[PDB]
Each structure stands twice: as C-alpha cells, then as structure tokens.
C-alpha cells in the first residue's frame, strides 16, 4: 500500500536518480549507518489531496540538518521528483483519500563505502482528529543549554536528525504521566519545542514562538501558523520564552506537519482554555494550504 | 559476503526445539525495514564485542549491559540465552568459511521494531575488525563539552544518559569536530566541568600512582574494558578508584588512556594540544593482558 521509492543519486559530490522499491521488504544493509548509529537527516511532509505541504522549505531544512552533520547536500532537484513521483505512485494505486505524508530519509551510507543513502515513502498518516480538539502535555528537562547550538555545535541541536531516541524517551515518559506529549525546557529554564513538533504561545494577545537559535527545529507548521494568524490580524513574535511564561499563556498549541495544530488542555495538570472554533479554523487553513 | 549475518526472531522475553531465536542471513543483502524504528528514529540499543582467537570477550558482561541499555529504553527484556548462542553461531560460521586469523567483532542490534507492529528486532553481525595498531600506540585527544550536568541520570531519565544506544549521530558528530582540530578522539566533559567518557570508549586516569576513572552514574557506560583494565592495574599493586574528576584534575593527569572493547587501550599523546608522557613499555603490557584476557576464562 505505501509507496517506496531508493534514491540513487541523494547528493552532489536522462537518469531520475531514484527507483521504486518494495516497501514491505527489507531494503537497508545492516551496517547502513542509520541504524548501526542514527547518523542521517530526515523530513516528513503532509501530502493533501495531492498536493506536498511547504515542500520548498523542507527540503531546504533537509539541506540545513545535512549540513550541520557534514552530509554531502542534497540533491535537490532529485528530492524534489522523488517526492513527487512516489505520492504520484501512491494515488494511481490507493486512489484518491485521507492525508498522506512524504518521509525522506538520508544517512551517511554504508560503513566504509563514503556513499550516502536515500530513501522516499509514501503513506497514510495516522488519525490525529482527536488530537486536534485538545491534548495534554508536561514540561521536560532537556539537559541542553538553550545556547548550545553556539557553543557546542557537535552535539546537533536543531538538527532534525535520525537520532531520535531520547525524543522517543520523551514521549514515554509523558505517557506514563497521563499526557500525550512533551514541551521541551533547557537546562536554564527556556521553553525549545515538543519532541516533533513547536510550541505555540498565545500570551498578552501576541503569539509566540520560541526562537529558532535555541537548538531548536525552526517548524514549517509554525511559520504557516504565522501567516495564519498574521493575516486574521493577531501580532507575531519570536522570542525567549521563559518556563514561567509558559503557565501564564493565555492558550498554547504544539504544530508538526502531520498532526498540524494541537491545542493544549493542560500543561503539568494545569488546565487551559481552549477556544475549538479558532483552532477549527486553523487547522482548516493549515489542512488546505497551498 | 565474508561477514556471518544472523537475524535475531526471538530477541526479547515476553519455544519448540528447532528454532533457536535465530537464522542465518546474507550480510550482502538489505536487511533492515525502511519503517524500523532502529533507522527511523535511532530507537534500539547495541552492543560490540571483541572476538579474540575465536573467543568473545568478556560476553556476559556484555549480554548484562545490552539489557540495562534495553531497561533504559523500556524496551522488554532481551533474551540472554538467544542472544549468547547467537553471537557463538555467528563467531562458528564466520570461522567455519573464512578460518580463523585475525581480531573479529561481534556487534548485537536491538530496535523496538518495525513501526505499529510491537515486536523488537535484534540481528548479530560478525566481520574483521579495523586496523588499530596505530592508535593502540597513541592518540591525540579533544575536551568537547557534553552539554550534559553529570547528575542527568539522576534528574532527568528520559535522555537516556548511560544507554548504549543507536541515537549516536552526536558522537559521531564529536569525531568530526576532533578530527576538525586535528585529533583522533574525544573526551566529553559535562556542563558542570566533570570528565565523562568518550564517545565510544572509557577514559582510565593515572595519578599519584592511583589509576582512576569516572564513576558510572555520571550518565555514561560501564564499560567491560575499563573494569578489565583496573584488573591489570590491580595485579600490578596499582591501587584503583571510581570517583568524580573534574575536567581540571584530568589535566593533571601522568597519564590517560581511553578504553573500548575493540580499540583497547589507546594512550593519550595530547590532550587538547597539552603533551601527556607515553610508557610504551606499561601501555603495550595492557594491550597484551587485555587481548589475552579471556584465553584464560578457557
Ligand atoms: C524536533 C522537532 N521539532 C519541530 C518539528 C516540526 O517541524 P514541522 O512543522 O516542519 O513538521 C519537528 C518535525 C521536529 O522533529
Ligand atoms: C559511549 C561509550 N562509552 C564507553 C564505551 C566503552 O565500552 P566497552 O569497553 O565495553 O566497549 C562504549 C563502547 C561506548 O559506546
Ligand atoms: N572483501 C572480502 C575479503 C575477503 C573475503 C571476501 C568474501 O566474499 O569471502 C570478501
């Protein structure tokens, strides 16, 4: 059912560069350095009724993660038909239907052969209309600094890279909390993101966001949640935004590609408002984008 | 291909005689899924295992820390009979076609599997291990901040500090930066200034003719090789110590070492541009011990 398309030519030093695979048979080498290491860059783009979401930026953040892990970059041009071949592949054979999302998958290759690996799939994404009406959520410590990207650029924050465990920890002990996700804080108190997603704060009628210096994911969601809410008229603002300040925000909402806007009902078992008919009409404007 | 491969069916604990939890496969050949958890999002553990003259060394300890590493993920228990008579096939079948010769790797994979699914995956991989005759002799060697306070494991569980883990894109990432400044390792030190380990290996401290190393609820590995090093020392009349060291008393240091199960051990020439003395002579003596350990345990 998914689509899965081995990209042959992911990077720059009448051939597409790219082959449809069997997405239900093994296809990477066991010392593939994604998995013996996590060592590669991923994105993940919704796809809406046909149409990939900010492609344009992600695969420049593809590009950036690449980058901060001395990858070879991208191949853009190649990405970009891979990406548009394989949802094509997917509608011909699923037909038309739900959300789908495009998952690129780039990796510093097989130990010892200095020849990066890249993969495209192609799929129906999990249900998040619950997720859209309200989740809980607990704050974090990350360990990190919130100026670690400055000083210790080695340890990959802001990266969205294939190391993804403590995310995944993350999550886990969130839900052995009784909420469904996590809103990151460093060390020094600052509020960063969710583990896949960015935090959305409306506070003293402004909506914030954290910066993206803060070894964080400078989100393709939250920047279209910016015009959304630039063009209904409220103001926009990046910034540091302190522990503290996150209870005393009038709303908050984490926003990804794939789940789009989730509003918070609680943060640490305090309860906040949520206001359904503007978070209806967000994700309405974030689902039909483009 | 000349690495053994075997597919790990029955890696964790919640069987008919005949199946054994594991089969051979072909190294060569794509093994992994493209939604395994193991490369989607680095979601497993690991271990690597030196295979001197046939044996691997120091096994249980190793089998033991793959399933703390494991617990620390909350993934289940992995089964340490399958996992054992599966690193024995695969040191059999790799010697069985390619003889014997030479140092060899055993390295153990544990993902939480393919995505929806509940059901881990494990694979054991056996192969040649890499040229370390060099380093063994010595190695230039950064200080790069962890980011870390030594306590996260204490405080903060869920980053995993102290797991042997797939997520290892930042310390490959370390590697880089020391080559960057012209070094073949690192030694990471935490927010709060105490030595660590290094991104793949234990660090081993001589002072005062105490050999020391930091303790291992600083959110780092116990490592078999540091445990088989402070036997050396120990023989020797050294007397051995866990303790805190900061990154300051590590300057101070006679002499450093950073150990792992397939380096060994690799003496310290510089430590971020500082000379540190190499005995030749003591340093070759603990690569000896260290690979002749286990012939004795047989
Ligand atoms: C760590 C992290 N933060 C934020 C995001 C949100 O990115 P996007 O809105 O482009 O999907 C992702 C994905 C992520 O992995
Ligand atoms: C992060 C890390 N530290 C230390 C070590 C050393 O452990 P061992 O001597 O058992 O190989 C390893 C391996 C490692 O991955
Ligand atoms: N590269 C290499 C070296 C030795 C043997 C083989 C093999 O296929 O047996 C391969």
């Given at each position: 059912?998914?689509?899965?398309?081995?990209?042959?030519?992911?990077?720059?030093?009448?051939?597409?560069?790219?082959?449809?695979?069997?997405?239900?048979?093994?296809?990477?080498?066991?010392?593939?350095?994604?998995?013996?290491?996590?060592?590669?860059?991923?994105?993940?783009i919704?796809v809406?009724?046909?149409?990939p979401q900010?492609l344009?930026?992600?695969?420049?953040?593809?590009?950036?993660?690449?980058?901060?892990?001395?990858?070879?970059?991208?191949?853009?041009?190649?990405?970009?038909?891979?990406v548009?071949?394989?949802?094509?592949?997917?509608?011909?054979?699923?037909?038309?239907?739900?959300?789908?999302?495009?998952?690129?998958?780039?990796?510093?290759?097989?130990?010892?052969?200095?020849?990066?690996?890249?993969?495209?799939?192609?799929?129906?994404?999990?249900?998040?209309?619950?997720?859209?009406?309200?989740?809980?959520?607990?704050?974090?410590?990350?360990?990190?600094?919130?100026?670690?990207?400055?000083?210790?650029?080695?340890?990959?924050?802001?990266?969205?890279?294939?190391?993804?465990?403590?995310?995944?920890?993350?999550?886990?002990?969130?839900?052995?909390?009784?909420?469904?996700?996590?809103?990151?804080?460093?060390?020094?108190?600052?509020?960063?993101?969710?583990?896949?997603?960015?935090?959305?704060?409306?506070?003293?009628?402004?909506?914030?966001?954290?910066?993206?210096?803060?070894?964080?994911?400078?989100?393709?969601?939250?920047?279209?949640?910016?015009?959304?809410?630039?063009?209904?008229?409220?103001?926009?603002?990046?910034?540091?935004?302190?522990?503290?300040?996150?209870?005393?925000?009038?709303?908050?909402?984490?926003?990804?590609?794939?789940?789009?806007?989730?509003?918070?009902?609680?943060?640490?078992?305090?309860?906040?408002?949520?206001?359904?008919?503007?978070?209806?009409?967000?994700?309405?404007?974030?689902?039909?984008?483009?």
């Open positions: 059912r998914a689509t899965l398309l081995t990209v042959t030519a992911p990077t720059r030093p009448g051939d597409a560069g790219f082959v449809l695979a069997d997405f239900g048979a093994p296809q990477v080498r066991i010392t593939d350095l994604g998995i013996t290491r996590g060592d590669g860059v991923f994105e993940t919704a809406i009724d046909g149409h900010a344009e930026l992600h695969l420049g953040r593809l590009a950036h993660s690449a980058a901060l892990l001395d990858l070879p970059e991208p191949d853009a041009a190649v990405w970009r038909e891979a548009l071949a394989g949802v094509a592949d997917y509608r011909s054979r699923n037909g038309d239907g739900g959300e789908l999302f495009a998952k690129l998958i780039l990796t510093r290759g097989i130990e010892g052969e200095g020849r990066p690996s890249g993969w495209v799939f192609v799929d129906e994404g999990e249900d998040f209309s619950q997720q859209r009406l309200g989740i809980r959520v607990v704050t974090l410590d990350r360990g990190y600094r919130h100026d670690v990207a400055e000083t210790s650029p080695w340890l990959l924050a802001g990266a969205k890279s294939l190391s993804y465990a403590t995310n995944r920890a993350a999550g886990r002990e969130a839900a052995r909390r009784g909420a469904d996700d996590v809103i990151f804080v460093s060390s020094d108190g600052y509020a960063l993101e969710g583990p896949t997603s960015n935090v959305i704060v409306l506070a003293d009628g402004v909506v914030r966001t954290p910066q993206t210096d803060q070894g964080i994911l400078a989100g393709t969601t939250q920047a279209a949640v910016f015009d959304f809410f630039e063009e209904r008229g409220y103001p926009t603002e990046y910034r540091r935004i302190s522990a503290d300040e996150l209870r005393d925000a009038e709303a908050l909402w984490l926003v990804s590609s794939v789940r789009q806007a989730a509003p918070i009902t609680a943060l640490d078992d305090r309860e906040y408002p949520v206001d359904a008919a503007l978070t209806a009409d967000l994700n309405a404007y974030l689902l039909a984008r483009t």
